[PDB]
Amino acid sequence: KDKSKELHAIKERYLRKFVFEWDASEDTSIDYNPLYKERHQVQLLGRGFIAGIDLKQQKREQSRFYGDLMEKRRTLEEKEQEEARLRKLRKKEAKQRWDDRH
Amino acid sequence: SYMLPHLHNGWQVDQAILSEEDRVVVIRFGHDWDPTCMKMDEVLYSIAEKVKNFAVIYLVDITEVPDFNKMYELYDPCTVMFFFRNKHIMIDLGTGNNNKINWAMEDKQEMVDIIETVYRGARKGRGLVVSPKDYSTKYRY
Amino acid sequence: QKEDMPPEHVRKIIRDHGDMTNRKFRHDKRVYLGALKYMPHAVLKLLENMPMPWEQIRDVPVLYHITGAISFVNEIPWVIEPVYISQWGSMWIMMRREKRDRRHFKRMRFPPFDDEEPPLDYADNILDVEPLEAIQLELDPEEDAPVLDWFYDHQPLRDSRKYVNGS
Amino acid sequence: VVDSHVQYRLGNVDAFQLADGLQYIFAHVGQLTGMYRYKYKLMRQIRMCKDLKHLI
RNA sequence: ACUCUGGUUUCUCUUCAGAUCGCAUAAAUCUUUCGCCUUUUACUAAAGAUUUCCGUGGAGAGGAACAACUCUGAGUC
RNA sequence: AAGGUAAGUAU
DSSP: OHHHHHHHHHHHHHOOOOOSSOOGGGOOOOOOOHHHHSOOOOOTTTTOOOSSSOHHHHHHHSOOHHHHHHHHHOOHHHHHHHHHHHHHHHHHHHHHHHHTTO | OOOSOEESSHHHHHHHHHSOSSSEEEEEEEOTTSHHHHHHHHHHHHHHHHTTTTEEEOEEETTTOGGGTTTTTOOSTTOEEEEETTEEOEEESSSSOTTOOOSOOSOHHHHHHHHHHHHHHHHHTOSEEEOSSOOSSOOOO | OOOOOOHHHHHHHHHHTSOTTSSGGGTTTHHHHHHHTTHHHHHHHHHHSOOOTTOSOOOOOEEEOTTSSOEEEOOOOOOOHHHHHHHHHHHHHHHHHHHHHOSSOOOOOSSSSOTTOOOOOIIIIITOSOOOOOOOOOOOTTTTTTTTTTOSOSSTTTTOTTTSOOO | OHHHHHHHHSSSSOHHHHHHHHHHHHTOHHHHHOHHHHOSTHHHHHHHHHHHHHHO
């Protein structure tokens, strides 16, 4: 299908009635090129936080490549500091979840 | 070049319309300096010679005679009111306002047919009459 | 120069000219009509001065008609960009949290009252004390020390020449 | 809009639902009032409002 | 270390717009094409040119309010 | 929005 998609793409290159809302027939994002169709999300090496995307979900949705690399590169003291920071963060999260649905 | 008789005074137009006998008094309200009204006046002048026996045209100026502007809601150019037999006739030509022709006729023969139909309806005594050509569409295509 | 006036006389005027179907406010005539020419403009102000979620209440002054025919809000909605963005980000987080917590959400009725609801008298039920509670966050006192002193206000830091011009 | 704020102030429904109803009305005027007939161009505004709401 | 240096909040008034007037964004009319097309209200959608419209800055003027506290540079200091 | 007022007759 992709080969035929490129084929007809090159062929195309060279050779009242009120409406309630928008229609899907105007979408332009449909590109057969897998590189363009599947674009690597710019995670900024663990620093990419989209506005509307849930922070916890984004952390879960993060590829964790940067996180894993930082964990590997972190020294023993750095690992201890990170463990303490995440323990405090987990305690804070438990504190917030205690208030919710109490 | 707008040589048709014109009512200098408002009351003069009233008595001129009143002083009618077996004739149709086409009072064309508007202003001569308007271009569409100039075309309408030219069409009326062309018709006047051919149908002067029963159709009399008597123009008037809204500024000169503003008392009748509110009487029949005179707030558009090229308005024509076939005030015949001391009775405002109901000329229906496929338009919302079936008592006022407020645009210059495309052809003189159409206006002649309209005015003779108005004369026939007025003589018959009916206060309403229809047009052989509906103007709901302009036949643009 | 001219100054302000107490709202009591405005309330008296609107109560007197409650309805024009009687012979009360019929003498206004052209004066009354004049104001009508600029009726939509005031609506613009009422769509620009309308409160934000943090604004529990606001006391913006108005330009009213001497006959009470029309009232004009003489306020251009001014908010500094960073503080507005911070406030609406706090509201974003808070709305997301509330949606997470609330198991069933309720939307109100398309007509807020009956289709023949009379104009509610300000002194009757608008003067009710109960203001409910605006959507306000609980920021960390240590981190939000330069925040909670004036945050969640209609015109924060007003009359503080060290930070803004003032009026 | 004014009556919605009035009923909010006079107790009734909480402020979270007040904001939700404000959002809806702002993004559903086309459905609420149907400006389509009143003015064709307004359709553009309402349709884009749906688009922004779509993202919101 | 010495002399002069002298306000900022404001309210309006009258001008000029350079400056993304505005780190936002509407509408109206006209004009050429596109879907046109069933007459205007209208449209669809772009271009072109105006206008109103929300606003703003510069500059100047006149009162009120802090006008007495000076800020500050100059004054071989 | 509309392009969907029958006219007539004296009260």
